[PDB]
Design an enzyme around this catalytic site. Sequence first.
Site, PDB file in Angstrom:
ATOM      1  N   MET C  87      49.277  12.315  17.482  1.00  0.00           N
ATOM      2  CA  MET C  87      50.015  13.396  18.116  1.00  0.00           C
ATOM      3  C   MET C  87      51.189  12.815  18.881  1.00  0.00           C
ATOM      4  SD  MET C  87      50.593  14.930  21.311  1.00  0.00           S
ATOM      5  CE  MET C  87      49.276  14.981  22.540  1.00  0.00           C
ATOM      6  N   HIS C 219      44.138  23.236  32.892  1.00  0.00           N
ATOM      7  CA  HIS C 219      45.131  24.314  32.947  1.00  0.00           C
ATOM      8  C   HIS C 219      44.482  25.681  32.907  1.00  0.00           C
ATOM      9  CE1 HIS C 219      48.475  21.380  31.471  1.00  0.00           C
ATOM     10  NE2 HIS C 219      47.924  21.024  32.616  1.00  0.00           N
TER      11      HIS C 219
HETATM   12 MN   LIG Z   1      48.177  18.154  28.613  1.00  0.00          MN
HETATM   13 MN   LIG Z   2      47.422  19.036  33.466  1.00  0.00          MN
END
Ligand SMILES: [Mn+2]
Ligand SMILES: [Mn+2]
Lengths: 387, 387, 387, 387
Positions: C87, C219
């Site tokens: 990635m 998050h």
């Molecule tokens: Mn991240």
């Molecule tokens: Mn973060």
Amino acid sequence: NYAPTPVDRFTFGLWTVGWQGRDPFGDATRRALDPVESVRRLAELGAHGVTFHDDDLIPFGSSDSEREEHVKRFRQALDDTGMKVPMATTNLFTHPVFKDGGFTANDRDVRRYALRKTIRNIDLAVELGAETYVAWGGREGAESGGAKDVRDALDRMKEAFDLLGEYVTSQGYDIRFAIEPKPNQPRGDILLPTVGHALAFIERLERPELYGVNPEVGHEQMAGLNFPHGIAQALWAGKLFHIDLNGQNGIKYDQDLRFGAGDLRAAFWLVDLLESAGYSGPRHFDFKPPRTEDFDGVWASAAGCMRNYLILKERAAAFRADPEVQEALRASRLDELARPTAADGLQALLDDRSAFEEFDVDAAAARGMAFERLDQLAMDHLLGARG
Amino acid sequence: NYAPTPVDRFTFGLWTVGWQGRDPFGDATRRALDPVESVRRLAELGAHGVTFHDDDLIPFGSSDSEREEHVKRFRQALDDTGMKVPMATTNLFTHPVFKDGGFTANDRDVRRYALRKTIRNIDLAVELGAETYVAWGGREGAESGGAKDVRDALDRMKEAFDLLGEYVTSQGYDIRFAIEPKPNQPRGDILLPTVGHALAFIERLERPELYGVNPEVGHEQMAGLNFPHGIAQALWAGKLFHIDLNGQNGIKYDQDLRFGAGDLRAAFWLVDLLESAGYSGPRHFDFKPPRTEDFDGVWASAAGCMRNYLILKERAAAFRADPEVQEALRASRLDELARPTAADGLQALLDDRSAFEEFDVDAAAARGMAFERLDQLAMDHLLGARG
Amino acid sequence: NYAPTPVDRFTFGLWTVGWQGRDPFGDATRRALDPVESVRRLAELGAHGVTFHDDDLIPFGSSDSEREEHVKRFRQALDDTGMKVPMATTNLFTHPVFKDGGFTANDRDVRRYALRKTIRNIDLAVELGAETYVAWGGREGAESGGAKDVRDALDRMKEAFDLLGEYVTSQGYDIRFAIEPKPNQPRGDILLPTVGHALAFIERLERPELYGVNPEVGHEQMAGLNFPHGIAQALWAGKLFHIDLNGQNGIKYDQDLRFGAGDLRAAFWLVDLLESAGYSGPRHFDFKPPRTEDFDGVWASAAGCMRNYLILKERAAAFRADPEVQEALRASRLDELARPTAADGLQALLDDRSAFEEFDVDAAAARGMAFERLDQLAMDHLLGARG
Amino acid sequence: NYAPTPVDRFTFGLWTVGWQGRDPFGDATRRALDPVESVRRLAELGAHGVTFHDDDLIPFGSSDSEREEHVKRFRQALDDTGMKVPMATTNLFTHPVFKDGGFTANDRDVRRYALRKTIRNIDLAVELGAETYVAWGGREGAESGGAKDVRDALDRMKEAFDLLGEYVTSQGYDIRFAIEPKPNQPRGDILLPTVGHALAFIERLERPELYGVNPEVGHEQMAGLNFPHGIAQALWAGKLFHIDLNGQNGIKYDQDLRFGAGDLRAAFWLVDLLESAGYSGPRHFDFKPPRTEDFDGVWASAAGCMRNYLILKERAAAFRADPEVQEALRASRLDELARPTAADGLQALLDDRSAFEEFDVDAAAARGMAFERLDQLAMDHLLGARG
Ligand SMILES: [Mn+2]
Ligand SMILES: [Mn+2]
Ligand SMILES: [Mg+2]
Ligand SMILES: [Mg+2]
Ligand SMILES: [Mg+2]
Ligand SMILES: [Mg+2]
Ligand SMILES: [Mn+2]
Ligand SMILES: [Mn+2]
Ligand SMILES: [Mn+2]
Ligand SMILES: [Mn+2]
Ligand SMILES: [Mn+2]
Ligand SMILES: [Mn+2]
Ligand code: NA
Ligand code: NA
Ligand code: NA
Ligand code: NA
Ligand code: NA
Ligand code: NA
Ligand code: NA
Ligand code: NA
């Protein structure tokens, strides 16, 4: 394994296992329990005792003869099981008369009634042997800024607690008070919202030695605070008179999950602290079996509270006793934290060039704290994954 | 309209308008400002004064001659503008040496250095005329449970503040200390996380009269708490020595928005409280112009802090002076809240049948509080929509 | 025990172990790491691969010859260790030019530059063998309501992603995109703040099959959401292209703790879900060793990420394989949840008296869910306390 | 001033003004209202219509003759006042049978019953003229990780909504569905917790055009999200079929304050967005007069919802019409945000040296956004303090 015994001082409110499951959106899912049933079932699980609000034991509005019969039946259950009653409290939140508060209601007649209701129950608590009388001011607060002058409300709250202290002193009672903070719910904001605010308030009472805190895991977590840290401050102040154990998933409505649920690592650090500090009070659970459960699930949830405490106690003890952990604590300078900064005194500190002109700040800043290795040892101990 | 004057005692930290815009993810967006520039520009906007950390005024590691020149230039700017310096503080958080704390670092050598750094700056603060010395222990805390024994850390924090109190007493200084709570950020959890915890700690210092709080709007809101309520408790305790004004949108990283941004209705109730209580200290802004802004936006943001305070002051005064609001406050029994519950004393309360046997709880419970009408009058006044 | 191997597909961003420790209040505490060092050290711990932002590998503003040399050295390190690069991503957040956004900056010239910067790095990602290209729009958002018209910003964000999809299609590349949501920080509110918002947005792109999500544990927890639930919805949609693993203590600034820290029980349920679902992508850690640590603590923290995943994998597998747990899952009707409600079809449901007129709602409501026993079996398995 | 008229399309749920005041800790404080009373009182305040759950209008378990009489009385009240019924919904949360869910209950018999209960009420909604049928899955979710397989639950939720879409199609009804997200409460976590998750789910239904969202101010704010931003995404998707207006103070239990209370500036930006976008649906209030209020306070609170909307509408219109604001919007490049990034196409962008090799990043980064001046104009307009 992990079998509780009365020695462990595990206690439960009648209103915990007795919660019928009514929530903001839903009707009761379980029938009401007779307190006698709860005492006998909790004893069978290895609990030490129960606690009560006045109106959990005696239906609101009962006659004197009804009150006597309810208490007599309860005392027979306690005698039949060996269960104790270490703590009691007043319900100053359910009845509509308390919609704006008890001790801090704007209406003076309500404030006076709230005091009389509490005083009646202090007498009963003493007769049942309680050492601690809890106050949870769940209706003290506001949804809007003009509704409650907080300085005036604090004056009324101090007046109320001072009168209760005068009362117990005058009767020669040994009971002490424990204030239970909560930040919100059912009021938009509640007065004395955290352990800190309650500790600060107590210092302004006329007889501060009679008052401590009853912190609840989930209530501090409803403000996103670190519950072990707040318990440490209460212990530091000499004010941890009682504690309410449960679980909570962060900043939400008060979930009252079983202890160990919610923030598991905070539960580990809490048990480590209580055991290390030698906390001698009840390990009281203020929790609610979810309304999805039948009575078998109620008793499973109560048993789980105690089991989780005992697992965490084992793991925290193994952490503290492990020579590798002791070495890591020294590597992280936990020993130095416990030593005075300047027992040599102010003048010696001011004269010490090693504290300023000759302090090598870059060499100091280069030293790692090794906190991550320490924390992974703690994780390994919690999970039983040492190796 | 709403033009600030030095009379309004509006003050700003050098680090506020001087923030270069570096954030957890981004480089600086503005060049550094000379403190002389900031003093002159703030004076042009109608500010009363500035405040500073040691290392905002004197670059860390400066020689004695460099220190003297930086202070001389700053004092000339103050003299040229009439600006005052009511408050100063120590930076015990930026330099890597403070990564585990200043006063509560696990390393004892760091704790001693932190004290010496603070003491040097107290001397400077006094020379510049400051009445208040703030302490923001932003590095005091932990990311993990084993890293910091909180009882030991509180012992070290008390030792440090007691030594500073001994110092100012010994020098005959009139300055007082104000502790600034914050719940988290940059540490995972910070010690003394709320106004309440700080108030409680102060009561255990050797000379508690020398210490108060410096609450910050956004810091209490980072725990979801009611800032006006916390200010009321500080005022009730006699401990509101200074205040930091800004805005915050709830439970997030510390945003330091301009005052009036974030929770606008809480800003209204705060100004109402400060003005009603006669708070006489600086109206200090601890804010950050967003990094999206150039210098014109910096000064616009600073001007907006003062403008918003003055608008809210006007609206809160009009609310309190409106005869319709005064009637609504009586309808909601705010007058009764301010009257003693039992000036007749405990025995009279116990003997008063109107407080128990003859109290009509259902009649009391039927009375509406009329809080919604009161709150809509408050909304109408805030918005200038009366009619 | 719990020793990671490349088989486990554990990956780390260069910016994770390479974080120098600068935070909103503090300077760097560690020197910069050469990416070659990080590749070799991570390989020694048993990592499978690394990931990068353009500007982690190639200093911003490098010449073509400098770019080639940085890539050559990095590729030699990958070849020397067997590490992969699954990635890559673009840094559209650090440089001041991106202060109002990249793809959704109000300034059109910035939007065009952001696209060109990304396209250059997609080419590099493909050359290094990456299967996934992540986009974290950390600057897309606002601190104030007038600054950003969100409908217009979503139009610009769709335009940008559609152009990137056209680009990869035109070059015949097999790489796919993964959008990383975050609710706030560094902007006051960020566009596409949760997994749900990102999934919904993707459905409106011109070639939706090219786009998925890269959810990050912390998050979703910054909005107080249940991370395993959000991952389940992403899996249900076929859109879990990549994942970022770390820890977070609730509603705070983005802490990026090592995986397993923060919400330990959510980490358990996440690993259970990923393993049960057969997620085949990288187990990527987006974490930050705390700034208290030296380099030994950096590598300890990285090793802990992998160790905790492997412990949780063992415990979740033991939970699912335990015949007592399988019985409890049936007692709680998890099997029924997996069966269609009405495979008989709408008309048969409408005609079925057992679904309405003859449904005994009180008998149904009396059945307990037995969820508490199930959850305590899960706790016992997590803690290795079965018995 | 600010007098609502039916033209404004203000609507209220029967359960709003009819809330009796029972909360997690307290008994009802108000008697039940006859829906006929509520219709007549709301009409007198200038409301346009009401909405209902099945069990608000027809007591659960009513016979066919009882159902007919309740509906007849309600329709007479609507006819007597001119009030409309634009929306209806099913109560799939109060009765104990729904303790683990309706459409996603683990028990299949409950899922089938939930569908039949909803279908019966869709028929009634259509007969009363409703255009929208709301679904609030308040019991869909879990308190523990093993209790609910979320992929299976999403399969069941899709099956249920697909069957309802088949039903309305088969009957030729014009009604459409609106899914109301909520993150938690009464379940520990609720499925489809935000507007984004609901929008994403809808895209996977068999007839997605029949489904939209019914976002509620306070529910998005219970996750700390920006409600205007989420409404913008719903509008961008063409899915804002209905809206629930109220107030909330951040991350707490669902407060359902009157609209304008809670986050006042978010209310301003919401009204600005709805009016600017030309939203044509009902302005529906899902609020609860606090339990402190008597019936006069109930009607005052309802009147305040409408008044606050109308004040904010005036202020937002004045903001958008002010030539100084229009100039500030151009200074902040809101016009550029609305223009395509690359209408010239991908190849032209790739060939454009002004987008890369010749882009002066430092000159671009030096440009201020002027967002603070814009936001202070917005504040001045909201407060009526222009000058
Ligand atoms: Mn991240
Ligand atoms: Mn973060
Ligand atoms: Mg010790
Ligand atoms: Mg007064
Ligand atoms: Mg399956
Ligand atoms: Mg437009
Ligand atoms: Mn609780
Ligand atoms: Mn409790
Ligand atoms: Mn701050
Ligand atoms: Mn401050
Ligand atoms: Mn709600
Ligand atoms: Mn609603
Ligand atoms: Na008073
Ligand atoms: Na104690
Ligand atoms: Na100590
Ligand atoms: Na004061
Ligand atoms: Na557009
Ligand atoms: Na997938
Ligand atoms: Na399924
Ligand atoms: Na729409």
